[PDB]
Amino acid sequence: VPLDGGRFATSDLNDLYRRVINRNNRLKRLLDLAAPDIIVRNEKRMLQEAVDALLDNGRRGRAITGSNKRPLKSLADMIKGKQGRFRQNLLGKRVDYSGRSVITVGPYLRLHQCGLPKKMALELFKPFIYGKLELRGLATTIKAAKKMVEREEAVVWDILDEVIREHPVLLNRAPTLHRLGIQAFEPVLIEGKAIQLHPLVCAAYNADFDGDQMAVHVPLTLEAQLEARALMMSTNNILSPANGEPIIVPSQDVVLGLYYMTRDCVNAKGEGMVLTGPKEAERLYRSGLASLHARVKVRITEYEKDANGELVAKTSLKDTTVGRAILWMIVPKGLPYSIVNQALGKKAISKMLNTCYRILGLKPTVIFADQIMYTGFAYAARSGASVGIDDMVIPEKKHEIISEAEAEVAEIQEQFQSGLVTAGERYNKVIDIWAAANDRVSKAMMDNLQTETVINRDGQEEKQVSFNSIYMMADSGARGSAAQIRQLAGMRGLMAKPDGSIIETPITANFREGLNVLQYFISTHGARKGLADTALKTANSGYLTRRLVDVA
């Protein structure tokens, strides 16, 4: 083919064919001319070699290189590899009617919606728009329709709004590890250039909003639209196919909000009032007359599903808090009150959703999941939870533990030079000592942190779980864990040399105190080892799953 610059671009098969033809013609010439036998033997070998290089290059030992430096690519090369026909153009291929962009959180969406930029939508649905511009008579011919669209007249936007309605689109994020990586959503047109994704579906996609991108595809035929709506729609995928457990699982901010709203506290505003149901609880809290944590007595009516599915109503006077009463207004009728009446963590919320599913069905759980998300965001924001540096408390007796362990190790090392202790004995003893010291420090830190608040209960003192923000993030299961907090406030611990051996002296400092040069250099070993492990482990995972998919 002619390149624009006047040059020509050619495939390699042209070259291989040319030399086969050349050798063949010259062999015919030689035989016609009655040559000596060594010459014709030479020609016969070279012809055979040319054919071999045509059919499969390099298998005959030495690959014929092109003009440049590199071997010519032959027919078998066009079939075989990862980049041959079979895997690259037949089993998976590039596609029309598709787009791609950065993702962003939209918290106002319902579980079956996704925000689609106006420009992407205008481009993807081009021919549909041409068709309905012609239908209404607004454009005589297709070329007029083009000019109408490229100048973006208002009727174009009205037509587009009428087109996308009820039309699902397919959202994909690579790598597509499991069948939940592709899901169908109903679009809502937005301005801007980023796709807005519902918060709850991030877990399935394994997506985080720090620069990821997703691809959008458009189903065209009626059958494609229907099976996007029936098989693939996001409200149809709430349980995982690997194990039976749900995948719509509220997470970081939702869990923090629900935890903060539900938890109870000592005497704070409004002890021992008696309330006519949750509505009064909300009216009290939002007027500033009571706190979310007050321990109050509220009148509550549960429903309970009968033998034949009837809902019997039961009314009673329960002991609860303002926060739990307010939360109860969301819960669909059919569930017991006992679900809400304890300080909810992550497990509790997931179990709440599972119960609602296996009792009531699908539609109530979808609506319930949304309302949980909305309430969790709202009250997490109203809590105003933050993170300062004073929030990472350090035990008052850390240095005592460290000094005792140091002196004891010093004496065991002094005892070594008496010859009473071999190398293995000393090494094992020192490691055991430092492990014990680490455990003591960690336990003291948790004791000081977890249940440290002393409150007057209208009189003398009382002891309750603390409202420290990092502890909240620990208990609620929002984001923290015990080990992370240990690193923030206890000791960072023991480290390992590049490969196996565990270094003798541990790191006694923590991130609030700050490491020194040598300790930082020590930790870098493990950091890089883990990071390289993940980087080079992804490929093995992929190859394994490919083999498994092909067998079965």
Partner 1 sequence: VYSYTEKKRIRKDFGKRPQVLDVPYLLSIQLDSFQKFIEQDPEGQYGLEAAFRSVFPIQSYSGNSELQYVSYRLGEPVFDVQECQIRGVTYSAPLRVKLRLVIYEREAPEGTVKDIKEQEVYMGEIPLMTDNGTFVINGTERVIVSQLHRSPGVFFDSDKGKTHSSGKVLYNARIIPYRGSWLDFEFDPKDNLFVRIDRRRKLPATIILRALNYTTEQILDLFFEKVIFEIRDNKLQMELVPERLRGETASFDIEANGKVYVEKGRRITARHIRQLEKDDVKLIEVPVEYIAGKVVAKDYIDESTGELICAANMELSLDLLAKLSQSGHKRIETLFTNDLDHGPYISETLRVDPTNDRLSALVEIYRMMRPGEPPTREAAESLFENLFFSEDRYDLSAVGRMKFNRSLLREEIEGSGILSKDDIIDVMKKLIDIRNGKGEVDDIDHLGNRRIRSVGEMAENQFRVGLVRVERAVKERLSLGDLDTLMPQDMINAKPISAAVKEFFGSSQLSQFMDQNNPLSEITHKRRISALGPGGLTRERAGFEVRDVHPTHYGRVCPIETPEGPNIGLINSLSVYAQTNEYGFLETPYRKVTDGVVTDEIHYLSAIEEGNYVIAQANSNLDEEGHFVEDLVTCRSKGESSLFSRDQVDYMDVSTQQVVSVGASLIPFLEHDDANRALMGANMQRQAVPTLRADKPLVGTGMERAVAVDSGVTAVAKRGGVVQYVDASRIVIKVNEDEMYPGEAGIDIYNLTKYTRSNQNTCINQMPCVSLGEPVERGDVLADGPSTDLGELALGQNMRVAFMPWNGYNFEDSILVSERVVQEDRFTTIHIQELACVSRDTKLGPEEITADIPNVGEAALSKLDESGIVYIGAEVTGGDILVGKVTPKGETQLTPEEKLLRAIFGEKASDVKDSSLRVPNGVSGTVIDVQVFTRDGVEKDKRALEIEEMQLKQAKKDLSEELQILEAGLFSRIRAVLVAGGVEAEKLDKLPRDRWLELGLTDEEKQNQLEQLAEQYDELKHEFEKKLEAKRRKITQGDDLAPGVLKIVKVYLAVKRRIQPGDKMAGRHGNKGVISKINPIEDMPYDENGTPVDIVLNPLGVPSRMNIGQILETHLGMAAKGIGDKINAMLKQQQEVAKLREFIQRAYDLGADVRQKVDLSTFSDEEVMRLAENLRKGMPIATPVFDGAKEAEIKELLKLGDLPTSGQIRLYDGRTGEQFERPVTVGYMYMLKLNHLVDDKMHARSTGSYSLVTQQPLGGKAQFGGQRFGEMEVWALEAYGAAYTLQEMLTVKSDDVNGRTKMYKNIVDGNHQMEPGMPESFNVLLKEIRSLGINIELEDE
Partner 2 sequence: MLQEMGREPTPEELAERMLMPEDKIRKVLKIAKEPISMETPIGDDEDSHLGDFIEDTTLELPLDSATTESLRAATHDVLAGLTAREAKVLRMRFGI
Neighbour tally for 228: CB within 10 Å: 22
Q: Which member of 3, 517, 551, 552 binds partner 1 (CB under 8 A)?
A: 517
Site string (50-89) toward partner 1, x via CB under 8 A: -----x-------------------xx-xx-----xxx-x
Q: Is 515 exposed, middle or buried (0-12, 13-18, 19+ CB in 10 A)?
A: middle
Q: Which member of 143, 151, 358, 547 binds partner 2 (CB under 8 A)?
A: 143
Helix (H, G, I), strand (E, B), or coil: what is residue 273? coil
Q: Binding site: residue ranges?
A: 208, 210, 212
Residues 533, 537, 542: CA angle, nearest 5 degrees: 170
Backbone angles phi, psi at 448, to 5 degrees: -70, -25
Nearest to 518 by CA among 505, 528, 530: 505
Site string (383-412) toward partner 1, x via CB under 8 A: xxxxxxxx-x--------------------
Compare residues 135 and 155 and give the one whose CB is closer to partner 1: 135
Question: Considering the complex, what minimum distance in angstroms separates the CB of residue 246 from partner 1?
Answer: 18
CA atoms of 266 and 438, how far apart (whole Å): 34
Neighbour tally for 528: CB within 10 Å: 11
Compare residues 134 and 513 and give the one whose CB is closer to partner 2: 134
Residues 249, 252, 257: CA angle, nearest 5 degrees: 100
Question: Among partner 2, Mg ion, partner 1, none, what binds residue 272 when CB lies within 5 to 8 Å by partner kind?
Answer: none
CA 531, 441, 252, 348 torsion-angle sign:
positive
CA atoms of 450 and 472, how far apart (whole Å): 9
Compare residues 11 and 316 and give the one whose CB is closer to partner 2: 11
Q: Binding site for Mg(2+): residue ranges?
A: 208, 210, 212
Question: Considering the complex, what minimum distance in angstroms separates the CB of residue 70 from Mg ion?
Answer: 37
Question: Considering the complex, what minimum distance in angstroms separates the CB of residue 118 from partner 2?
Answer: 22
Region near partner 2 per CB under 8 A, out of 63-71, 217-225, 438-446, 491-499: 63-71
Site string (65-84) toward partner 2, x via CB under 8 A: -xxx-x--x-----------
The answer to whether 380 contacts partner 1 (rule: CB under 8 A) is yes
3-state SS record for 123-186: HHCHHHHHHHHHHCCCCCCHHHHHHHHHCCCHHHHHHHHHHHCCCCEEEECCCCCCHHHEEEEE
CA atoms of 144 and 127, how far apart (whole Å): 13
Site string (337-366) toward partner 2, x via CB under 8 A: ------------------------------
The CA-to-CA distance between both ends of the chain, in Å, stands at 44
Question: Considering the complex, what minimum distance in angstroms separates the CB of residue 275 from Mg ion?
Answer: 45
Compare residues 139 and 348 and give the one whose CB is closer to partner 2: 139
State the angle between helix axes of 346-360 and 363-383 in degrees (0 to 180), rounded to the nearest 10: 160
Q: Show me where the chain is broken: residue before each gap, C-N > 2.5 A.
A: none
Question: Considering the complex, what minimum distance in angstroms separates the CB of residue 21 from partner 2?
Answer: 18
The answer to whether 415 contacts partner 1 (rule: CB under 8 A) is no
Site string (210-249) toward Mg ion, x via CB under 5 A: x---------------------------------------
The answer to whether 343 contacts partner 1 (rule: CB under 8 A) is no
Sequence-separated (6 or more) residues with CB below 8 Å from residue 230: 236
The answer to whether 208 contacts Mg ion (rule: CB under 5 A) is yes
Compare residues 122 and 330 and give the one whose CB is closer to partner 2: 122
The answer to whether 142 contacts partner 2 (rule: CB under 8 A) is yes
The answer to whether 548 contacts partner 2 (rule: CB under 8 A) is no
Q: Which residues bind partner 2 (CB under 8 A)?
A: 1, 3, 6-12, 66-68, 70, 73, 141-143, 146
